Design a protein around this nucleic acid. Sequence first.
DNA 1: CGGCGTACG
DNA 2: CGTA
DNA 3: GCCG
Length: 326
Amino acid sequence: MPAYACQRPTPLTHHNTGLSEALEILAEAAGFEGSEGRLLTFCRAASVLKALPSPVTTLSQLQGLPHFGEHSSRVVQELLEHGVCEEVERVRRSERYQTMKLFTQIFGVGVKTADRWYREGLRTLDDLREQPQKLTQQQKAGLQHHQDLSTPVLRSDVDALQQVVEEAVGQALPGATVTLTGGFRRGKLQGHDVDFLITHPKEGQEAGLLPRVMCRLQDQGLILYHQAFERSFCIFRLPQPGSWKAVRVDLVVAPVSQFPFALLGWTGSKLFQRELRRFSRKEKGLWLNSHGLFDPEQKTFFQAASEEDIFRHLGLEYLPPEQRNA
DNA sequence: CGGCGTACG
DNA sequence: CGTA
DNA sequence: GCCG
Ligand SMILES: Nc1ncnc2c1ncn2[C@@H]1O[C@H](COP(=O)(O)NP(=O)(O)OP(=O)(O)O)[C@@H](O)[C@H]1O
Ligand SMILES: [Cl-]
Ligand SMILES: [Cl-]
Ligand SMILES: [Cl-]
Ligand SMILES: [Mg+2]
Ligand SMILES: [Mg+2]
Ligand code: NA
């Protein structure tokens, strides 16, 4: 088992679901406390279990697995022995965890804002609605739409949204294309949002595109919330039988020269990309982002025509999106 | 011990 | 600060 | 919290 998540296939569904879920509770709680290092180790240990070919049934099967030391092994041991880990259950029922989860789930609220509100004594969404002076426009929208945004986006919803975006994109710039990215491209059947990547086959024609797209979607009455730009984090009005629901949609524009890097970056998973960028820098001495891959010795950028090119550049076996579910 | 992804709005 |  |  290699040490980086980008070195091994990780399927969406696997054989250690309960164990990985428990470790990811501890990772999430670490993040709520600002402990980024412990968050990473618990995320990585969870991801290792996702990549295994069969269930862990005995503690000895953790020997030699990367990112399993005393703490993560004890968590697994307790789950195997008793079906529950006391530390995990204590986190789950704690007021701190439940409120930080509730607050950081709001669009426009991160850990730092959630934590300040927690320390001020705030605990519920209605607590926030009662003091709207303390809210940004973005947070106001996130709170108004919170119930709809808490409902999973279905793969069956994605196709309708993509046609709508393609219509506006085609008027904004004929020939521009729309590619589904994010979790749905990795095979997920549900999501928290829909992520789209937009480009044009003629380098440079994509300049200034996203304002033109957003103006057209807004004119069609489809935009419940949005903020020159190349990323847009929106709330869309999605038709439903006899009504509609609010859905988060992310739009990103990239020039075609950067499209493989942007596709790779925006297809995720989040942990897969962090691990990939960590691997690139630490093992290969190359700097990776959603725009390119930089050699800081030669001061040159790698040209890539595909995701396959990028994996080859980095000396990694290619993983299709369905195996990037780290 | 230092390191832990990397951008844009 | 938020967001991907 | 774990790796190197
Ligand atoms: N913090 C991050 N660091 C690096 N890449 C990230 C980060 N957040 C998001 N991304 C990239 O943006 C993609 C879309 O982000 P999302 O926040 O939309 N997560 P996604 O994988 O789509 O699952 P859902 O919760 O939406 O169902 C991710 O899959 C990553 O490729
Ligand atoms: Cl470029
Ligand atoms: Cl590609
Ligand atoms: Cl980036
Ligand atoms: Mg998504
Ligand atoms: Mg998104
Ligand atoms: Na949030």
